[PDB]
Amino acid sequence: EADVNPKAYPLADAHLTKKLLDLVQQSCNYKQLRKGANEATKTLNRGISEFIVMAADAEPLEIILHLPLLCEDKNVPYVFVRSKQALGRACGVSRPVIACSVTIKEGSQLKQQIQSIQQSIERLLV
């Protein structure tokens, strides 16, 4: 009842989800956020993504499963959070968001937090 698609790998725990959503909110405030699977795709193809966050309850999940494949291509960290409602809430948007991308910005006041999250993600992807 009902959770959670095994294919939504890697999945953040409660503590990491909180960090991710915080940083996604900041990224938004600092103009470093792309909202939406389509725009995420564009960031990856262009090599301007710091990391990708996707929603585990996207239905069907395959509408974003191209992203991990793209990320593997580009050596780019990606993670899943449980709730698209929460991600959209963190994206400063008034509808769910199934995927978003924090973008590379030279001199970003957020370099340190972004770098930190990348490590957090990387250690789940082993």
Partner RNA sequence: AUCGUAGCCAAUGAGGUUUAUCCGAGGCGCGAU
Residues lying near RNA in the complex (CB under 7 A): 35-40, 42, 57-59, 63, 84, 88, 93-99
Residues with Cβ < 8 Å from 70, sequence gap 6 or more? 41, 44, 45, 76
**58 contact, one of another protein, RNA, none, CB 5-8 Å limit per kind:** RNA
**69 contact, one of another protein, RNA, none, CB 5-8 Å limit per kind:** another protein
Instruction: Report, in Å, the least distance between residue 34 CB and another protein.
Output: 11
Which has the closest alpha carbon to 125: 11, 48, 44, 5? 11
Nearer to RNA, 20 or 35 (CB): 35
Residues with Cβ < 8 Å from 115, sequence gap 6 or more? none
Instruction: Report, in Å, the least distance between residue 105 CB and RNA.
Output: 14
Tokens of 84: 């698209």
Contacts to another protein by CB under 8 A: 38-39, 41-42, 45, 60, 62-66, 69-70
- The CA angle 40-46-49, to the nearest 5 degrees, is 50
Nearer to another protein, 60 or 107 (CB): 60
**70 contact, one of RNA, another protein, none, CB 5-8 Å limit per kind:** another protein
- DSSP lists the bridge partners of residue 102 as 33, 51
